[PDB]
RNA sequence: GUAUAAGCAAUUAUACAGCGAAACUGCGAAUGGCUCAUUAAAUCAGUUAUCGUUUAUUUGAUAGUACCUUACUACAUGGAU
RNA sequence: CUAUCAACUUUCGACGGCUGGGUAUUGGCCAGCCGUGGUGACAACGGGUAAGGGUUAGGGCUCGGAGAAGGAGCCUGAGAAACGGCUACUACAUCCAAGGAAGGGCAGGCGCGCAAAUUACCCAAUCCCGACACGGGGAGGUAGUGACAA
């Protein structure tokens, strides 16, 4: 375990020690023939082997949050942690490297994942009930819940009808593609492929609600932000034109402001009826932001952000002021936050993959109740 | 020798400076013994260069172990992939503003050396040794890397390459 | 055709895709105000 | 697309064509010495290498890229009847632009590595003839 | 799940066969390895005769080709310009056998000063082809990539010149 | 909790009876590995300090180092890993541990003393064990008895005496063979090896000289032909 | 573990050594053109009656096969290869008759001392060096230039070198080993080349009788000269 | 290959020497043979090819690779179990 | 064998060619780009289920898919998708001090209350596996019953 910044303390408990580190054949080598003296006490892992070799690319624990679900890439697969038992329930392989899982039901008993191959792959506990080939590539995957249908976006414009882009959804009481909900990304080539061509032409990132109305948002390359309403099956707005790749969007606790971001490094929380920003923060380098998620210290209210110059800063929301900064210090590619308080999962670019405890935004998770008393035991030694 | 290279780069990085703050996984990995070529492409062009307004720090601490390293007999291979490649690797991706300092600890008692006068020979020097026969031969090899992967840029460095070289040719050839 | 490999949306019903989730609706709002929110954005 | 090339040849130089024969006493086309397209399952251009049988026979269906089918007739000996029938057969081969292509001409080809699924031939020597369509019969 | 036998497929003339056989381990596939631009990360495969290939997975540099004047250099690796099949790829910046990329360009830069002498991209057989020199005077050349990456742990190749320069660069301007 | 109480420095061990939990309050929520003072156990153990390295809780599970959990957890472990050792090769078996944190419900506390007080506990610190067996290797030998190069290890190799069966007879001596002993059995066979590689070499110049005499006679033999 | 009757029709069992037979182990010649030293010793020559009995014979150095001792029971030893028993003072080599079998042959020093091997390719190998590759798998460094495919080398069997070479001719006598026609000593008199695979000769005996044989079955065995005995 | 079994059995030059349980190390188990919904030139047979491939074991050959700024040096190599 | 099977494939790409991925390698085997195919009244396709070759007097003799309680995923090795192991889910089931912990075959008898061939002995021969002359082998051979016959 370790401690980063200064005034309000994160502390990396697991992660890589090293933005190179050696093979792990050389590694066990040289553990197991050469003389070390490390530290046994403050080094350890605390979920049985949360790693995957080569890199990782989603972490998202569940609504019961007794299982973290993580998909990674050499041999590519997906672990399954019991979260109780600190250990791997099981892992499972599959056959590309995945992009974006999420579950289904409140336990791990039911998932789903677009996959790299243009496919989407339905996950039981019992094996794997069938994959769907998507027609076209596919960015990030949505579910609505209140009428159940896996809601995907997708790059390039479509094959007839409209040239405007597409947003593939499929019902699973229904079980057909329903009809793409049809997004304008811009003018492309004539003379292409129906995959699209390598400069533009692509929906990034779709965010919608489960608690509260749960407007369809979805965010296109062109700069533009765009609502979908259920039980209309149509568009109600097209805004926010920027210059950079929209890469974020997520909704508050109370169900109005959103939380957008572009592949510059800008950032925009939005009211659902004020064109004007609420707020704006230029912040970073130019290597794109990934991942927004709004997370309540018990009283207050405060911003992530997570960009893979491994810069993660904490923002706050009713002043601005940058809370707290973490470098990661290798690329991550996706943070979680456990739904109690404190602990912040990123699945990053390194062997292990790492997660960040807040004394200072919350408590630590009602699985690990000892990573308190070990951050007491750091404060002593400091 | 690596073990003491070792000891003396943690000397150094105890003093704690914070120009060599920024580079010290940089630089303790050129003496782990399996990723100096890998280590080398990823100091010089990289994303973390060597920023030129603490590059007046870390410059001499760096040489002097890339030094040590183009030295080291140990891990090299034979033939010429066994350390020609990789002093020429080292010389290859340096300046030529670093090459003088290179060039410094290159030559210890032949740095200021004189072969030539107002008058013809130095016989008063040319009769003398301070270097053995042994290790003339690795700084001529390394004097050869240099100026093979110099070229022009040796127009400020005449006045002391010159004088090594002449006088490690006539030792050789007194010693015919 | 050159639509084979999923290329185009062929509309069949599948079969072990049929009955996975049974519909919850968790909406905090009362459908009442709802419909009056999308009328109110940027254009009115 | 990306620029086609014979793979170890090097053009840009500032200081030729590779083309192997076949051998089996054949002969290499002029379309095949000089001619400037570049095609890797041609026995004179790419690496393919033609060993083992050596067929025959009248082409049914040139229209296709660079593929074409051959229509083998045999007679095959029926017991039953203790007479010869006519058994029609199609096989498939890899063109090369080297030769002047006709429809119902006899056409040599040779065996190669599989280069498809029904692909395990190459064109060798056409015979120009005056050959019919599908009601032109010869055991060939 | 993933093979490579035909017995799913439909045969010459157009019919499917039952053809029930157990999936071998002759017949076997493994997961394609998407080689991205990071730091290395190689995972070893042992293979039939205990044979090891090298699953590259993230890579940062490899040896490119002027081989017009006779040297290689190991140089780092920017991002992928264009490929030739997909536009994914493209997307998602990866390396792959006969991917236009760019590369750095100063071992090469420093070995035309070091050999001929004559500064470049600032007698008569030191000549650059000018479209070359502008890749030059970018510090960034136009490299392809002919190693297989996936399959020997390495992206190395050779650089673009003349025709093929030319080429690629109107397949960019495409 | 008893506490099995070890000595590693003098090599002697101990199992003490603790009762009255009120003492072990101290041991509560440390980890393994970490440094306890003895001095609030009791009136002898005034200036120890110790390291606790595991244990046994109730129903008798083991204490894997590394596990945050203070309940009984169910790992899954590997093959170099401790409380499992392999069936078979290549085996993970999923088995029961208890976290790392010493509780109320443990049975038996494994401790190491690091550092000793004034006063010496009457059968831990007195008794001194000796090693089980000396060092095999020369140099191992050298290091321990720091020999210069003339003094010869053979006569400095440890020894030990027992008395055989046949109703008793002399003592008899036992002694290790020491492995990194240069000999000139060892030295005969390097010899030999580098002879067989010089053999080699000069019979490859041999037959690679008569290939290129008979071919410069064949070739003229062609051309007298031709 | 095959049957007696399984077992091939040329290394001869008779109704007696039950209803198995020894598979050959691998080695130099083939499987299904070998005979083992068990077969040889005790199924052949007698010298035995057990496999206990062979292995007491094979485990101490009284065997030695092509001039070098072969310890384990089922080695390879299909053709030509010399077997010195030193205690018996014998040395026998194998050949074939005109019905196609294995046949041995008595033998002393002078005649056992040499070794006519069939090459089988001729190449370059590591190190630039020219290397030669027989029927028994010998490899020779730095051969004559001359001995190529298909030509049969007198071989030392002392150093292993090569000593002399006969070429491939049409009007040199040649000894079959596969086929329908195997083994029928005769003179090889015509040879057709039938590029694109599997070329012929055409081969008549000593009395009159025109047969085809491939390429690959031959195997040359001297113009008259009988440089191995072949039993009168 | 590794023996200080606190294991047996000894003496005429004492690291070891003979036998040698335990254990570390290397090899082994692509089968011996069982059950039952079947395989309709796809298997299978003849007949080719690998210039399109992997091969422990066998047996045969086999490897010219020093110096190259540690010298005011190094020259009976380590740690684990 | 059949036209009471004339259209079939493109309904897991159907035929190419280009580019790569993966494989030990070729290959629509798989992924991107486009072209229009491929088979069939000379019998495709579908349907029926009743699943021989070589040795030549002769008979004889020789050779000839799916599972290890059920799906799903993984590990070793030259060779397995071993089912030998692991993990999760599902389904039985055992011990316990009630906290926990190990496990998934064939053969035999009854199959009415009335019935009928040994729970035999050894690797000794032939053969196989190993650090290896010795150690280990459910092929094989030896014996016992028998008024069904002969």
């Known amino acids: 375990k370790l401690t980063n910044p200064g005034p309000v303390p994160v502390y990396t408990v697991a992660g890589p020690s090293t933005a190179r580190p050696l093979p792990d054949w050389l590694l066990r080598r040289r553990k197991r023939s050469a003389k070390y003296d490390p530290e046994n006490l403050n080094n350890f892992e605390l979920i049985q082997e949360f790693e995957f070799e080569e890199a990782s690319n989603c972490v998202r624990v569940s ?75 596919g960015r990030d995957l949505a579910y609505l819940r209140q009428s ?235 | 020798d690596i073990e003491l290279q070792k000891l003396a780069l943690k000397a150094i990085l105890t003093w704690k400076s914070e120009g060599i703050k920024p580079y010290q996984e940089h630089l303790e990995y050129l003496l782990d013994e399996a990723r100096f070529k890998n280590e080398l492409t990823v100091l010089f062009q ?125 030792n050789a050839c007194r010693k015919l | 055709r050159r639509a084979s490999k999923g290329r185009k949306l062929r509309y069949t019903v599948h079969e072990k895709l049929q009955n996975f989730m049974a519909p919850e609706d968790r909406r905090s709002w009362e459908e009442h105000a709802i419909d009056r929110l999308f009328g109110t954005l940027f254009g009115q | 697309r990306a620029f086609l090339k014979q793979p170890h040849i090097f053009l840009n130089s500032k200081v030729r064509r590779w083309y192997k024969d076949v051998g089996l006493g054949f002969k290499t086309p002029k379309t095949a010495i000089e001619g400037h397209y570049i095609d890797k399952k041609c026995p004179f251009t790419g690496m393919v290498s033609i060993r083992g049988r050596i067929l025959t026979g009248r082409v049914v269906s040139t229209k296709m890229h660079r593929t074409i089918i051959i229509r083998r007739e045999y007679l095959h000996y029926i017991p039953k009847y203790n007479r010869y029938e006519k058994r029609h057969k199609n096989l498939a081969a890899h063109v090369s632009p080297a030769f002047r292509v006709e429809e119902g001409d006899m056409v040599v080809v040779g065996q190669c590595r599989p280069l498809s699924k029904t692909v395990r031939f190459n064109v060798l020597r056409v015979l120009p003839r005056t050959g019919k369509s599908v009601k032109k019969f010869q055991k060939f | 799940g993933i093979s490579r036998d035909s017995r799913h497929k439909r045969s010459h003339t157009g019919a499917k066969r039952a053809f029930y056989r157990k999936k071998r381990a002759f017949e076997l596939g493994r997961q394609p390895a998407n080689t991205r631009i990071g730091p290395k990360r190689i995972h070893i495969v042992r293979t039939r005769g205990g044979n090891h290939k090298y699953r590259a997975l993230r890579l940062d540099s490899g040896n490119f080709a002027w081989g017009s004047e006779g040297c290689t250099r190991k140089t780092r690796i920017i991002g992928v310009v264009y490929h ?41 057989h030191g000549k650059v082809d000018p479209a070359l020199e502008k890749q030059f005077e970018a510090g960034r050349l136009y490299a392809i990539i002919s190693s297989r990456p996936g399959q020997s742990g390495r992206a190395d190749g050779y650089i673009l010149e003349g025709e093929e320069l030319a080429f690629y660069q109107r397949k960019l301007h495409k | 909790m008893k506490l099995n109480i070890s000595h590693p420095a003098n090599g002697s061990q101990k199992l003490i009876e603790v009762e009255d939990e009120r003492k072990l309050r101290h041991f509560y929520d440390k980890r393994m590995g970490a440094e306890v003072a ?22 008798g599970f083991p204490m894997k180092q590394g596990v945050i959990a203070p309940n009984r957890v169910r790992l899954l472990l590997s093959e170099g890993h401790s409380c499992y050792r392999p069936r078979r090769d290549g085996e993970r078996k999923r088995k029961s541990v208890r976290g790392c944190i010493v509780g109320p419900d443990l049975s038996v506390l494994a401790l190491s003393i690091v550092k000793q007080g004034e006063q010496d506990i009457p059968g831990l610190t007195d008794v001194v064990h000796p090693k089980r067996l000396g060092p095999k290797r020369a140099t191992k030998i050298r290091r321990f008895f720091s020999l210069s190069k003339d003094d010869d290890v053979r006569k400095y190799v440890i020894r030990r005496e027992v008395q055989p069966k046949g109703e008793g007879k002399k003592p008899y001596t036992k002694a290790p063979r020491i492995q990194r002993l240069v000999t000139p059995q060892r030295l005969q066979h390097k010899r030999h090896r580098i002879a067989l590689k010089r053999r080699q070499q000069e019979k490859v110049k041999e037959e690679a000289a008569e290939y290129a005499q008979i071919l410069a006679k064949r070739v003229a033999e062609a051309k007298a032909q031709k | 573990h095959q049957k007696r009757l399984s077992a091939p029709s040329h290394w001869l069992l008779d109704k007696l050594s039950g209803a198995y037979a020894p598979r050959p182990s691998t080695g130099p010649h083939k499987l299904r053109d070998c005979m083992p030293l068990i077969v040889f010793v005790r199924n052949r020559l007698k010298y035995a009656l057990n496999y206990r009995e062979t292995k007491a014979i094979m485990m101490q150095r009284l065997v030695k096969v092509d001039g070098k001792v072969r310890t384990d029971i089922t080695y390879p030893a299909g053709f030509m290869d010399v077997i010195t028993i030193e205690k018996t003072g014998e040395n026998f080599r194998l050949i074939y ?62 150093t292993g070198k090569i000593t002399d070479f006969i070429k491939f001719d049409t009007g040199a006598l040649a000894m079959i080993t596969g086929g329908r026609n195997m083994g029928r000593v005769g003179v090889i008199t015509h040879r057709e080349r039938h590029d694109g695979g599997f070329g012929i000769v055409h081969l008549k005996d000593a009395l009159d009788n025109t047969f085809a044989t491939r390429e690959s079955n031959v195997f040359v065995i001297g113009s008259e000269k009988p440089w191995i005995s072949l039993p009168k």
């Not at chain 2, 290859?92 to 072969?115: H, K, N, T």
């Not at chain 2, 001529?140 to 390459?161: F, H, K, Q, R």
């Not at chain 6, 009791?42 to 109730?58: A, F, Q």
Request: with cysteine; hydrophobic share 35%.
């Open chain 1, 148 to 382: 159940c249908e896996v809601l995907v976006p997708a790059v390039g414009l479509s094959s007839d009808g409209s040239g405007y882009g597409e947003v593939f959804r499929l019902d699973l009481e229904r079980g057909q593609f329903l009809r793409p909900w049809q997004v304008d990304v811009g003018e492309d080539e004539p003379g292409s492929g129906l995959q699209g061509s390598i400069h533009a032409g692509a929906v990034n990132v779709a965010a919608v609600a489960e608690n509260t109305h749960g407007l369809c948002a979805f965010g296109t390359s062109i700069g533009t932000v765009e609502f979908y309403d259920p039980r209309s099956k149509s568009r109600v707005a097209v805004l926010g034109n920027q210059d950079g790749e929209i890469t974020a969007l997520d909704y508050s606790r109370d169900g109005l402001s959103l939380a957008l971001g572009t592949s510059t490094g800008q950032i925009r929380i939005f009211d659902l009826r004020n064109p004007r920003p609420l707020l704006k923060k230029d912040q970073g380098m130019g290597l794109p932001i990934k991942n927004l998620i709004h997370l309540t210290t018990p009283t207050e209210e405060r911003k992530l952000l997570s960009a893979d110059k491994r810069i993660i800063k904490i923002w706050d929301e009713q002043s601005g002021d940058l809370w707290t900064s973490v470098e990661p210090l290798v690329d991550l590619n996706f943070v979680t936050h456990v739904p109690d308080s404190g602990m912040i999962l990123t699945a990053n670019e390194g062997k292990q993959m790492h997660c960040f405890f807040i004394p200072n935004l919350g408590l630590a998770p009602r699985w690990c109740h000892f990573l308190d008393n070990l951050v007491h035991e750091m404060e002593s030694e400091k």
């Open chain 1, 63 to 137: 609504e019961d949050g007794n299982w973290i679900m993580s998909t990674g890439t050499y041999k590519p697969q997906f672990h399954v942690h019991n979260t109780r038992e600190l250990s791997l329930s099981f892992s499972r392989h599959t056959n590309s490297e995945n992009v974006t899982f999420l579950l289904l039901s409140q336990d791990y008993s039911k998932s789903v994942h677009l996959q790299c191959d243009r496919t989407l792959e339905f996950h039981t506990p019992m094996g794997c009930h069938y994959s769907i080939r998507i027609p076209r590539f």
């Open chain 7, 97 to 158: 008759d005109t019905k196609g079998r294995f046949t041995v042959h008595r033998i002393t020093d002078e005649e056992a001392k040499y070794k006519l091997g069939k090459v089988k390719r001729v190449q370059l190998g590591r190190g630039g060096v020219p290397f030669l590759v027989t029927h028994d798998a010998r490899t020779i460094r730095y051969p004559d230039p001359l001995i190529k495919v298909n030509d049969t080398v007198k071989i030392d069997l002392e």
């Open chain 2, 46 to 170: 990289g994303d973390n260069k060597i920023l030129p307004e603490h590059r007046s720090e870390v410059i001499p601490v760096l040489l002097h172990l890339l030094y040590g390293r183009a030295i080291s007999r140990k891990g090299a291979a034979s033939g010429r992939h066994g350390l020609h490649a990789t002093r020429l690797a080292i010389i290859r991706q340096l300046d030529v503003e670093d090459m003088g300092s290179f060039l410094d600890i290159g030559l210890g008692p032949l740095r200021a050396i004189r072969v030539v006068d107002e008058q013809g020979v130095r016989e008063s020097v040319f009769a003398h040794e301070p270097l053995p026969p042994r290790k003339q031969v690795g700084l001529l090899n390394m004097l050869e890397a240099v100026i093979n992967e110099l070229g022009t840029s040796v127009e400020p460095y005449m006045d002391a390459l010159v004088n090594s070289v002449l006088y490690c040719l006539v």
């Open chain 6, 38 to 59: 003895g001095d609030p156990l009791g009136p002898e153990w005034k200036g120890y300090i110790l390291r606790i390295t595991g244990g046994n809780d109730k129903q």
């Open chain 5, 84 to 124: 030739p099949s997909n536009n994914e790829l493209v997307r998602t910046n990866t390396l792959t056998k006969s991917a236009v990329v760019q590369i750095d360009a100063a071992p090469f830069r420093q070995w035309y000063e070091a050999h001929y002498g004559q500064p470049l991209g600032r007698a008569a």
